[PDB]
Tab-separated table of N, CA and C in Angstrom:
chain	number	residue	atom	x	y	z
A	188	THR	N	1.149	-1.194	0.672
A	188	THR	CA	0.362	0.123	-0.374
A	188	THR	C	1.064	1.651	0.375
A	189	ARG	N	0.651	2.215	0.017
A	189	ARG	CA	0.639	4.114	-0.282
A	189	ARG	C	1.081	4.052	1.325
A	190	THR	N	1.387	3.448	2.435
A	190	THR	CA	1.463	3.538	3.705
A	190	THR	C	2.802	3.690	4.192
A	191	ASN	N	3.500	2.531	3.132
A	191	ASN	CA	4.784	2.472	3.047
A	191	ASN	C	5.355	3.850	2.299
A	192	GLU	N	5.142	4.194	1.319
A	192	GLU	CA	5.128	5.310	0.404
A	192	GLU	C	5.501	6.260	1.383
A	193	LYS	N	4.599	6.717	2.250
A	193	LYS	CA	4.442	7.905	3.286
A	193	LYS	C	5.497	7.542	4.015
A	194	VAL	N	5.796	6.590	4.510
A	194	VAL	CA	6.596	6.972	5.823
A	194	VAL	C	7.865	6.586	5.143
A	195	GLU	N	8.334	5.885	4.053
A	195	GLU	CA	9.949	6.062	3.120
A	195	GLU	C	10.375	7.298	2.910
A	196	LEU	N	9.496	7.910	2.215
A	196	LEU	CA	9.387	9.294	1.561
A	196	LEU	C	9.694	10.427	2.978
A	197	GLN	N	9.041	10.513	4.364
A	197	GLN	CA	9.260	11.054	5.109
A	197	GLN	C	10.837	11.073	5.951
A	198	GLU	N	11.312	9.793	5.793
A	198	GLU	CA	12.175	9.037	6.165
A	198	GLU	C	13.471	9.892	5.374
A	199	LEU	N	13.071	9.676	3.936
A	199	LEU	CA	13.730	10.077	2.894
A	199	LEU	C	13.965	11.546	3.119
A	200	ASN	N	13.165	13.016	3.022
A	200	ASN	CA	13.251	13.973	3.479
A	200	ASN	C	13.840	14.401	4.720
A	201	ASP	N	13.855	13.913	5.577
A	201	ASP	CA	14.494	14.079	6.823
A	201	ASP	C	16.595	13.435	6.189
A	202	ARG	N	16.844	12.585	5.830
A	202	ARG	CA	17.675	12.179	5.219
A	202	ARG	C	18.327	13.289	4.241
A	203	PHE	N	17.792	13.835	3.239
A	203	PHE	CA	17.651	14.923	2.668
A	203	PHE	C	18.518	16.230	3.260
A	204	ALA	N	17.641	16.649	4.509
A	204	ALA	CA	17.714	17.668	5.208
A	204	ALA	C	18.857	17.902	5.622
A	205	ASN	N	19.007	15.925	6.346
A	205	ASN	CA	20.428	16.130	6.656
A	205	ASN	C	21.587	16.907	6.596
A	206	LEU	N	21.879	15.727	4.924
A	206	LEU	CA	22.733	15.861	3.899
A	206	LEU	C	23.334	17.645	3.801
A	207	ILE	N	22.093	18.258	2.929
A	207	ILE	CA	21.815	19.650	3.171
A	207	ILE	C	22.894	20.671	3.908
A	208	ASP	N	22.295	20.063	5.425
A	208	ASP	CA	23.087	20.551	6.645
A	208	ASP	C	24.716	20.190	6.452
A	209	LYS	N	24.797	18.973	6.559
A	209	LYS	CA	26.136	18.868	6.328
A	209	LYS	C	26.848	19.430	5.200
A	210	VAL	N	26.493	19.486	4.317
A	210	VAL	CA	26.687	19.819	2.590
A	210	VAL	C	27.847	21.912	3.316
A	211	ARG	N	26.695	21.922	3.968
A	211	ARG	CA	26.581	23.820	3.859
A	211	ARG	C	27.963	23.351	5.520
A	212	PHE	N	27.771	22.708	5.538
A	212	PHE	CA	29.207	22.354	6.739
A	212	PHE	C	30.341	22.600	6.186
A	213	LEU	N	30.483	21.635	5.381
A	213	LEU	CA	31.477	21.144	4.413
A	213	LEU	C	31.930	23.091	3.576
A	214	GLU	N	31.183	23.645	3.521
A	214	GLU	CA	31.312	24.851	2.704
A	214	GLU	C	31.931	25.520	3.862
A	215	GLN	N	31.788	26.059	5.140
A	215	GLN	CA	31.747	26.775	5.950
A	215	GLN	C	33.649	26.443	6.291
A	216	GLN	N	34.207	24.472	6.255
A	216	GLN	CA	35.202	24.048	6.404
A	216	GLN	C	36.142	24.664	5.353
A	217	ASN	N	35.452	24.699	4.367
A	217	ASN	CA	36.575	24.516	2.917
A	217	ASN	C	36.802	26.533	2.956
A	218	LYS	N	36.065	26.768	3.277
A	218	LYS	CA	36.042	28.636	3.094
A	218	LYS	C	37.348	28.425	4.681
A	219	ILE	N	36.898	27.867	5.202
A	219	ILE	CA	38.672	28.171	6.533
A	219	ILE	C	39.926	27.282	6.183
A	220	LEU	N	39.858	26.259	4.958
A	220	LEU	CA	40.486	25.599	4.655
A	220	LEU	C	41.041	26.683	3.314
A	221	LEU	N	40.313	27.441	2.934
A	221	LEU	CA	41.196	28.505	1.976
A	221	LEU	C	41.764	29.329	2.433
A	222	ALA	N	41.560	29.599	4.202
A	222	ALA	CA	42.200	30.862	4.600
A	222	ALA	C	43.565	30.769	5.131
A	223	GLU	N	43.573	29.712	5.896
A	223	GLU	CA	44.516	29.010	5.949
A	223	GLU	C	45.845	28.683	5.145
A	224	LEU	N	45.095	27.928	4.101
A	224	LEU	CA	46.122	28.150	2.526
A	224	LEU	C	46.702	29.016	2.162
A	225	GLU	N	45.649	29.859	2.266
A	225	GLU	CA	46.112	31.158	1.670
A	225	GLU	C	47.741	32.188	3.143
A	226	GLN	N	47.370	31.799	4.005
A	226	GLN	CA	47.825	32.428	4.713
A	226	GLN	C	49.624	31.430	5.032
A	227	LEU	N	49.466	30.381	4.305
A	227	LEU	CA	50.592	29.731	4.370
A	227	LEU	C	51.323	29.890	3.106
A	228	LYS	N	51.440	29.491	1.934
A	228	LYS	CA	51.093	30.443	0.604
A	228	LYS	C	52.062	31.690	1.455
A	229	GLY	N	51.176	33.086	1.710
A	229	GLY	CA	51.832	34.159	1.905
A	229	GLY	C	52.911	34.285	3.074
A	230	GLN	N	53.155	33.180	3.744
A	230	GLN	CA	54.650	32.836	4.753
A	230	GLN	C	55.835	32.048	3.423
A	231	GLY	N	55.434	31.693	3.295
A	231	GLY	CA	56.101	30.550	1.890
A	231	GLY	C	56.988	31.387	0.923
A	232	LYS	N	56.201	32.822	0.300
A	232	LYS	CA	56.571	33.771	-0.283
A	232	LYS	C	57.358	34.850	0.112
A	233	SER	N	56.794	34.721	1.325
A	233	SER	CA	57.243	36.174	1.677
A	233	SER	C	58.937	35.676	2.126
A	234	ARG	N	59.026	34.598	2.957
A	234	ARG	CA	60.133	33.957	3.310
A	234	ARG	C	61.395	33.734	1.750
A	235	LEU	N	60.914	32.723	0.797
A	235	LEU	CA	61.381	33.245	-0.920
A	235	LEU	C	62.095	34.175	-0.988
A	236	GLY	N	61.260	35.277	-0.864
A	236	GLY	CA	60.792	36.518	-1.495
A	236	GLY	C	62.338	37.210	-0.832
A	237	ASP	N	62.497	37.060	0.255
A	237	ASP	CA	63.525	37.068	1.347
A	237	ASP	C	65.030	36.690	1.017
A	238	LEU	N	64.916	35.545	0.643
A	238	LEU	CA	66.228	34.846	0.625
A	238	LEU	C	66.451	35.511	-1.541
A	239	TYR	N	65.685	36.038	-1.997
A	239	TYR	CA	65.749	36.046	-3.083
A	239	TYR	C	66.513	37.703	-2.633
A	240	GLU	N	66.236	38.464	-1.527
A	240	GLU	CA	66.545	39.560	-1.706
A	240	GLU	C	67.828	40.001	-1.558
A	241	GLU	N	68.091	39.121	-0.060
A	241	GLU	CA	69.248	38.915	0.734
A	241	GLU	C	70.322	38.559	-0.124
A	242	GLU	N	70.412	37.626	-1.724
A	242	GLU	CA	71.685	36.862	-2.591
A	242	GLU	C	71.703	38.590	-3.110
A	243	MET	N	70.636	39.336	-4.127
A	243	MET	CA	70.720	40.539	-4.269
A	243	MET	C	71.666	41.663	-3.263
A	244	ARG	N	71.217	41.543	-1.982
A	244	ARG	CA	71.724	43.235	-1.128
A	244	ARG	C	72.769	42.617	-0.949
A	245	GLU	N	73.451	40.587	-1.276
A	245	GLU	CA	74.597	40.551	-0.376
A	245	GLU	C	75.819	40.853	-2.258
A	246	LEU	N	75.257	41.018	-3.176
A	246	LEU	CA	76.050	41.362	-4.236
A	246	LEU	C	76.819	43.154	-3.754
A	247	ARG	N	75.196	43.389	-3.204
A	247	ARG	CA	75.566	45.235	-3.404
A	247	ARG	C	76.400	45.805	-2.467
A	248	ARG	N	76.396	45.204	-1.102
A	248	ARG	CA	77.193	44.872	0.104
A	248	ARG	C	78.778	44.567	-0.742
A	249	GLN	N	78.988	43.928	-1.347
A	249	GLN	CA	80.049	43.278	-1.948
A	249	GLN	C	80.791	44.668	-2.776
A	250	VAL	N	79.820	44.957	-3.539
A	250	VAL	CA	80.303	45.628	-4.847
A	250	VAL	C	80.407	47.154	-3.985
A	251	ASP	N	79.661	47.124	-2.813
A	251	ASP	CA	80.171	48.909	-2.694
A	251	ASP	C	81.759	49.011	-1.706
A	252	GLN	N	81.920	47.415	-1.050
A	252	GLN	CA	82.599	47.124	-0.156
A	252	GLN	C	84.199	47.297	-1.481
A	253	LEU	N	83.885	46.633	-2.539
A	253	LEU	CA	84.894	46.918	-3.621
A	253	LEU	C	85.378	47.845	-3.649
A	254	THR	N	83.963	48.844	-3.872
A	254	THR	CA	84.490	49.900	-4.477
A	254	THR	C	85.134	51.123	-3.381
A	255	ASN	N	85.507	50.725	-2.295
A	255	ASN	CA	86.073	51.439	-1.555
A	255	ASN	C	87.355	51.084	-0.836
A	256	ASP	N	87.832	49.799	-1.137
A	256	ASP	CA	88.704	49.555	-1.169
A	256	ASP	C	89.369	49.620	-1.886
A	257	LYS	N	89.564	49.640	-3.725
A	257	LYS	CA	89.919	49.912	-4.375
A	257	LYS	C	89.830	51.710	-4.846
A	258	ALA	N	88.932	52.010	-3.726
A	258	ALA	CA	89.099	53.563	-3.491
A	258	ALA	C	90.758	53.639	-2.669
A	259	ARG	N	90.539	53.243	-1.877
A	259	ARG	CA	91.945	53.427	-0.664
A	259	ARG	C	93.374	53.345	-1.654
A	260	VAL	N	93.156	51.957	-2.533
A	260	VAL	CA	94.466	52.013	-3.235
A	260	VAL	C	94.633	52.780	-3.526
A	261	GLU	N	93.330	53.317	-4.092
A	261	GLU	CA	93.825	54.380	-5.640
A	261	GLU	C	94.347	55.912	-5.153
A	262	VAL	N	94.003	56.198	-3.764
A	262	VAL	CA	94.990	57.580	-2.751
A	262	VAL	C	95.542	57.176	-3.038
A	263	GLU	N	96.393	56.026	-2.728
A	263	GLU	CA	97.527	55.747	-2.069
A	263	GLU	C	98.682	55.557	-3.628
A	264	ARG	N	98.145	55.089	-4.914
A	264	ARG	CA	98.359	54.880	-6.224
A	264	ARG	C	98.691	56.222	-6.748
A	265	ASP	N	97.810	57.292	-6.361
A	265	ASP	CA	97.866	58.944	-6.661
A	265	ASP	C	98.787	59.148	-5.950
A	266	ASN	N	98.904	58.812	-4.768
A	266	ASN	CA	100.592	59.781	-3.947
A	266	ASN	C	101.341	59.191	-4.496
A	267	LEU	N	101.565	58.252	-4.949
A	267	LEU	CA	103.004	57.612	-5.495
A	267	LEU	C	103.096	58.487	-6.648
A	268	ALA	N	102.489	58.632	-7.381
A	268	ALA	CA	102.305	59.476	-8.958
A	268	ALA	C	102.870	61.169	-8.706
A	269	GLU	N	102.139	61.491	-8.056
A	269	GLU	CA	103.387	62.648	-7.713
A	269	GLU	C	104.263	62.513	-7.117
A	270	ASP	N	104.143	61.929	-6.658
A	270	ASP	CA	105.978	60.903	-5.663
A	270	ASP	C	107.181	60.883	-6.701
A	271	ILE	N	106.929	60.152	-7.624
A	271	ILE	CA	107.643	59.635	-9.098
A	271	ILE	C	107.691	60.762	-9.694
A	272	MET	N	106.585	62.024	-9.738
A	272	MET	CA	106.702	63.267	-10.963
A	272	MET	C	107.482	64.462	-10.190
A	273	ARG	N	108.414	64.157	-9.123
A	273	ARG	CA	108.729	65.284	-8.100
A	273	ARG	C	109.512	64.987	-8.352
A	274	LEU	N	110.414	63.191	-7.825
A	274	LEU	CA	111.250	62.732	-8.419
A	274	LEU	C	112.341	62.928	-9.090
A	275	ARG	N	111.659	62.658	-10.370
A	275	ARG	CA	112.043	62.595	-11.450
A	275	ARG	C	112.165	63.922	-12.344
A	276	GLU	N	111.068	64.806	-11.528
A	276	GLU	CA	112.224	66.516	-11.564
A	276	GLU	C	112.776	66.937	-11.168
A	277	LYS	N	113.976	66.167	-9.777
A	277	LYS	CA	115.178	66.110	-9.548
A	277	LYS	C	116.324	65.435	-9.804
A	278	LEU	N	116.155	64.990	-10.885
A	278	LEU	CA	116.827	63.573	-11.382
A	278	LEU	C	117.650	65.010	-12.880
B	203	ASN	N	1.621	50.287	-16.424
B	203	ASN	CA	1.778	49.057	-16.676
B	203	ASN	C	1.290	48.597	-17.588
B	204	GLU	N	2.182	48.259	-18.640
B	204	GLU	CA	1.278	46.959	-19.934
B	204	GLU	C	1.536	46.176	-19.365
B	205	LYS	N	1.158	45.367	-19.898
B	205	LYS	CA	1.011	43.970	-18.879
B	205	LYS	C	1.585	43.095	-21.021
B	206	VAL	N	2.578	41.866	-20.835
B	206	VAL	CA	2.761	40.840	-22.054
B	206	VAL	C	2.156	39.568	-21.827
B	207	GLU	N	2.023	39.461	-23.553
B	207	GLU	CA	1.263	37.957	-23.678
B	207	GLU	C	1.790	36.584	-23.197
B	208	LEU	N	1.890	35.748	-23.011
B	208	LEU	CA	3.160	34.003	-22.844
B	208	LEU	C	3.874	34.694	-23.965
B	209	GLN	N	3.069	34.171	-25.509
B	209	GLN	CA	4.177	33.722	-26.414
B	209	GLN	C	4.907	34.733	-26.159
B	210	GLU	N	4.637	36.254	-26.035
B	210	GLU	CA	5.790	37.461	-25.901
B	210	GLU	C	6.803	37.491	-25.056
B	211	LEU	N	6.156	36.972	-24.074
B	211	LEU	CA	7.618	36.395	-22.387
B	211	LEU	C	8.584	35.653	-23.164
B	212	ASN	N	8.280	34.684	-23.703
B	212	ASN	CA	9.165	32.966	-24.506
B	212	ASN	C	9.605	34.303	-25.347
B	213	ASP	N	9.681	35.534	-26.063
B	213	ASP	CA	10.616	35.545	-26.998
B	213	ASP	C	11.737	36.548	-26.481
B	214	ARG	N	11.074	37.350	-25.526
B	214	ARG	CA	12.081	37.943	-24.757
B	214	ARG	C	12.980	37.522	-23.440
B	215	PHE	N	12.810	36.408	-22.713
B	215	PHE	CA	13.357	35.839	-22.149
B	215	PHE	C	14.312	34.620	-23.206
B	216	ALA	N	14.093	34.442	-24.874
B	216	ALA	CA	14.795	33.721	-25.501
B	216	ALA	C	15.637	34.418	-25.853
B	217	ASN	N	15.556	35.556	-26.336
B	217	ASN	CA	16.749	36.620	-26.450
B	217	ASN	C	17.907	36.713	-25.688
B	218	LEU	N	17.146	37.037	-24.322
B	218	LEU	CA	17.588	38.058	-22.851
B	218	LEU	C	18.570	36.111	-22.861
B	219	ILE	N	18.262	35.100	-23.349
B	219	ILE	CA	19.034	33.713	-22.979
B	219	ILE	C	19.961	33.805	-23.595
B	220	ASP	N	19.983	34.511	-25.411
B	220	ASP	CA	21.009	34.899	-25.950
B	220	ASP	C	22.086	35.060	-25.104
B	221	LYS	N	21.700	36.422	-25.064
B	221	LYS	CA	22.537	37.829	-24.984
B	221	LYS	C	23.438	37.172	-23.524
B	222	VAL	N	23.164	36.434	-23.235
B	222	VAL	CA	24.106	35.835	-21.864
B	222	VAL	C	24.978	34.689	-21.950
B	223	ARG	N	24.404	34.387	-22.863
B	223	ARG	CA	25.319	32.813	-23.229
B	223	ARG	C	26.434	33.434	-24.326
B	224	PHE	N	26.615	34.892	-24.776
B	224	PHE	CA	27.274	35.866	-25.393
B	224	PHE	C	28.351	36.569	-23.851
B	225	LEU	N	27.548	37.269	-23.209
B	225	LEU	CA	28.194	37.106	-22.558
B	225	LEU	C	29.180	36.188	-21.880
B	226	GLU	N	28.798	35.459	-21.615
B	226	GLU	CA	29.145	34.116	-20.997
B	226	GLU	C	30.814	33.816	-21.705
B	227	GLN	N	30.778	33.958	-23.459
B	227	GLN	CA	32.044	33.697	-24.414
B	227	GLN	C	32.609	34.856	-23.962
B	228	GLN	N	32.702	35.796	-23.932
B	228	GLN	CA	32.927	37.191	-23.847
B	228	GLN	C	33.883	36.480	-22.305
B	229	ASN	N	33.164	36.623	-21.635
B	229	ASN	CA	33.737	36.632	-20.295
B	229	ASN	C	34.401	35.328	-19.990
B	230	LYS	N	34.664	33.969	-20.724
B	230	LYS	CA	35.987	33.025	-21.149
B	230	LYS	C	37.070	33.696	-21.918
B	231	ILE	N	36.761	34.216	-23.356
B	231	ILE	CA	37.648	35.424	-23.475
B	231	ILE	C	39.044	35.706	-22.625
B	232	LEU	N	38.244	36.064	-22.326
B	232	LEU	CA	38.658	37.695	-20.928
B	232	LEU	C	39.410	36.698	-20.028
B	233	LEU	N	39.052	35.931	-19.285
B	233	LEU	CA	39.349	35.065	-18.298
B	233	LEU	C	40.979	34.651	-19.169
B	234	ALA	N	40.888	33.961	-20.715
B	234	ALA	CA	42.156	33.563	-21.262
B	234	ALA	C	43.115	34.561	-21.155
B	235	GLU	N	42.727	35.727	-21.505
B	235	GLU	CA	43.851	37.032	-21.690
B	235	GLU	C	44.045	37.563	-20.472
B	236	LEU	N	43.718	37.294	-19.462
B	236	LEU	CA	43.902	37.746	-18.112
B	236	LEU	C	45.302	36.615	-17.997
B	237	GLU	N	44.492	35.347	-18.000
B	237	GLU	CA	45.535	34.252	-17.047
B	237	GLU	C	46.678	34.084	-18.051
B	238	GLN	N	46.628	35.286	-19.438
B	238	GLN	CA	48.249	34.981	-20.379
B	238	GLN	C	48.940	36.312	-19.676
B	239	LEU	N	48.239	37.252	-18.830
B	239	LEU	CA	49.118	38.624	-18.749
B	239	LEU	C	49.635	38.312	-17.512
B	240	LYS	N	48.985	37.735	-16.543
B	240	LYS	CA	49.548	36.640	-15.365
B	240	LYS	C	50.694	36.190	-15.603
B	241	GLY	N	50.603	34.759	-16.147
B	241	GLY	CA	51.805	34.496	-16.833
B	241	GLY	C	53.083	35.284	-17.297
B	242	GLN	N	52.696	36.366	-17.945
B	242	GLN	CA	53.728	36.887	-18.909
B	242	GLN	C	54.607	38.046	-17.656
B	243	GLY	N	53.674	38.585	-16.639
B	243	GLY	CA	54.249	39.704	-15.673
B	243	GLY	C	55.054	38.715	-15.266
B	244	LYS	N	54.502	37.404	-14.528
B	244	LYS	CA	55.469	36.639	-13.718
B	244	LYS	C	56.667	36.477	-14.588
B	245	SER	N	56.518	36.066	-15.769
B	245	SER	CA	58.228	36.454	-16.218
B	245	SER	C	59.047	37.578	-16.439
B	246	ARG	N	57.971	38.396	-16.379
B	246	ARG	CA	58.466	39.799	-16.626
B	246	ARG	C	59.417	40.233	-15.253
B	247	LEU	N	59.002	39.415	-13.866
B	247	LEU	CA	59.390	40.386	-12.796
B	247	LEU	C	60.561	38.872	-13.457
B	248	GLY	N	60.816	37.609	-13.394
B	248	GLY	CA	61.478	36.525	-13.463
B	248	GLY	C	63.340	37.704	-13.552
B	249	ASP	N	62.806	37.578	-15.031
B	249	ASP	CA	63.004	38.701	-16.641
B	249	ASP	C	64.259	39.577	-15.108
B	250	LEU	N	63.436	40.189	-14.557
B	250	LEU	CA	64.154	41.953	-14.014
B	250	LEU	C	65.051	41.112	-12.847
B	251	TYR	N	64.604	40.781	-12.060
B	251	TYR	CA	65.757	40.263	-11.182
B	251	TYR	C	66.930	39.406	-11.784
B	252	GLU	N	66.890	38.865	-12.908
B	252	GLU	CA	67.463	38.153	-13.526
B	252	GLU	C	68.466	38.462	-13.656
B	253	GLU	N	67.986	39.620	-14.593
B	253	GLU	CA	69.362	40.932	-14.934
B	253	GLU	C	69.567	41.670	-14.145
B	254	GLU	N	69.158	41.779	-13.266
B	254	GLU	CA	69.752	42.522	-11.644
B	254	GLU	C	71.422	41.849	-11.674
B	255	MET	N	70.797	40.792	-10.932
B	255	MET	CA	71.944	40.005	-11.078
B	255	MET	C	72.941	40.024	-11.668
B	256	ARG	N	73.333	39.534	-13.071
B	256	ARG	CA	73.474	39.039	-13.831
B	256	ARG	C	74.524	40.741	-13.582
B	257	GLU	N	73.823	41.947	-13.850
B	257	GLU	CA	74.729	42.788	-14.042
B	257	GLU	C	75.309	43.025	-12.804
B	258	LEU	N	74.946	43.033	-11.770
B	258	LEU	CA	75.848	43.216	-10.737
B	258	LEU	C	76.976	42.094	-10.250
B	259	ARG	N	76.802	40.999	-10.972
B	259	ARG	CA	78.452	40.091	-10.250
B	259	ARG	C	78.824	40.098	-11.342
B	260	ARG	N	78.292	41.139	-13.169
B	260	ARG	CA	79.407	41.704	-13.670
B	260	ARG	C	80.053	42.523	-12.788
B	261	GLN	N	79.646	44.206	-12.212
B	261	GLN	CA	80.198	44.421	-11.758
B	261	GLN	C	81.071	44.045	-10.620
B	262	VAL	N	80.522	42.912	-9.653
B	262	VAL	CA	81.629	42.190	-9.134
B	262	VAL	C	82.728	41.750	-9.831
B	263	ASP	N	82.754	41.166	-10.720
B	263	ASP	CA	84.108	40.694	-11.210
B	263	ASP	C	84.949	42.051	-12.138
B	264	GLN	N	84.202	43.021	-12.266
B	264	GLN	CA	84.732	44.174	-13.213
B	264	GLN	C	85.739	44.282	-11.693
B	265	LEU	N	85.442	45.031	-10.523
B	265	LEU	CA	85.730	45.585	-9.819
B	265	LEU	C	87.472	45.456	-9.077
B	266	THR	N	87.145	43.166	-8.648
B	266	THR	CA	88.001	42.707	-8.432
B	266	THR	C	89.188	42.608	-9.097
B	267	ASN	N	88.744	43.291	-10.522
B	267	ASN	CA	90.248	42.750	-11.556
B	267	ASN	C	90.481	44.257	-11.563
B	268	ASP	N	90.136	45.326	-11.359
B	268	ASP	CA	90.351	47.026	-11.697
B	268	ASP	C	91.108	46.740	-10.560
B	269	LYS	N	90.426	46.394	-8.962
B	269	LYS	CA	91.147	46.624	-8.004
B	269	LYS	C	92.356	45.924	-7.504
B	270	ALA	N	92.948	44.639	-7.959
B	270	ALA	CA	94.101	44.318	-8.312
B	270	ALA	C	95.062	44.828	-9.140
B	271	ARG	N	94.872	45.583	-10.723
B	271	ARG	CA	95.520	45.964	-11.281
B	271	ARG	C	95.575	47.153	-10.865
B	272	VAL	N	95.176	48.026	-9.458
B	272	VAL	CA	95.673	49.238	-9.117
B	272	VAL	C	96.415	49.067	-8.268
B	273	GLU	N	96.001	47.557	-7.279
B	273	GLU	CA	96.899	48.032	-6.384
B	273	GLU	C	98.829	47.211	-7.037
B	274	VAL	N	98.820	46.340	-7.999
B	274	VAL	CA	100.343	46.014	-8.602
B	274	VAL	C	100.814	47.609	-9.190
B	275	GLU	N	100.136	48.804	-9.878
B	275	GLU	CA	100.445	50.228	-10.200
B	275	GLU	C	100.689	50.185	-8.945
B	276	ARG	N	100.921	50.834	-8.136
B	276	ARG	CA	100.414	51.188	-6.570
B	276	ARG	C	102.683	50.313	-6.070
B	277	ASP	N	102.157	48.901	-5.968
B	277	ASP	CA	103.570	48.262	-5.749
B	277	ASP	C	104.724	49.019	-7.004
B	278	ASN	N	104.268	48.646	-8.052
B	278	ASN	CA	105.274	49.172	-9.126
B	278	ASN	C	105.521	50.882	-8.555
B	279	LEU	N	105.122	51.629	-8.137
B	279	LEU	CA	105.327	52.886	-8.302
B	279	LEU	C	105.876	53.018	-6.553
B	280	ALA	N	106.011	51.782	-5.962
B	280	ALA	CA	106.992	52.044	-4.725
B	280	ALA	C	107.792	51.784	-4.454
B	281	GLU	N	108.379	50.360	-5.616
B	281	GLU	CA	109.451	50.416	-6.265
B	281	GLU	C	109.888	51.120	-7.422
B	282	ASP	N	109.933	51.586	-8.123
B	282	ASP	CA	110.144	53.087	-8.596
B	282	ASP	C	110.919	53.592	-7.992
B	283	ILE	N	110.092	54.747	-7.168
B	283	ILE	CA	110.177	55.496	-6.230
B	283	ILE	C	111.815	55.094	-5.338
B	284	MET	N	111.314	54.417	-4.664
B	284	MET	CA	112.720	53.789	-3.616
B	284	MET	C	113.649	53.513	-4.822
B	285	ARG	N	114.348	53.433	-5.562
B	285	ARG	CA	114.964	53.130	-6.650
B	285	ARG	C	115.605	54.216	-7.183
B	286	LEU	N	114.873	55.060	-6.815
B	286	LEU	CA	114.567	56.372	-7.962
B	286	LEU	C	115.800	57.093	-6.781
B	287	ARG	N	114.989	57.317	-5.420
B	287	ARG	CA	115.407	57.765	-3.894
B	287	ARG	C	117.372	57.212	-3.997
B	288	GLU	N	117.145	56.102	-4.761
B	288	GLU	CA	118.700	55.412	-4.616
B	288	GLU	C	119.497	56.120	-5.736
B	289	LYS	N	119.596	56.550	-6.306
B	289	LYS	CA	120.265	56.931	-7.460
B	289	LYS	C	120.756	58.320	-7.082
B	290	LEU	N	119.426	59.684	-6.877
B	290	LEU	CA	119.821	60.571	-6.290
B	290	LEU	C	120.018	61.126	-4.969
């Protein structure tokens, strides 16, 4: 008879209603998951960006040092160029 | 408030369905175009960092040699002067 029907249907609609609730929770959960993931990506990229920056910053610091080193050794060499230029005029 | 006949409403929503499909296709083209642009900008930024580091290494190399020479001249000038005081 159609009394079975009435039973099964009521059960089943409650089941749908249940899944519905759970799938909407699945959604809250996913949303949060995505937020976490965004946070983790941003750290990873932050850091990686730190390492690329460092590499460059090192080459720069080195260039400036080298540049000052050479500049000291030049002050010295140029001080000696005036010396031979004078002493040759005493010869 | 003008009222519409049903067979007329079907027309208007049939046409609106056309228009919407069209926007779908546009938006599609756009999404691919953007995706490419994105990709290209990633490549561009890579390159820019790349060239900066190449140019910098060139500079380190250049300066390291330039400084070794000038040290040599300095030493040479030291020698010449000392032996030049030797004569006079």
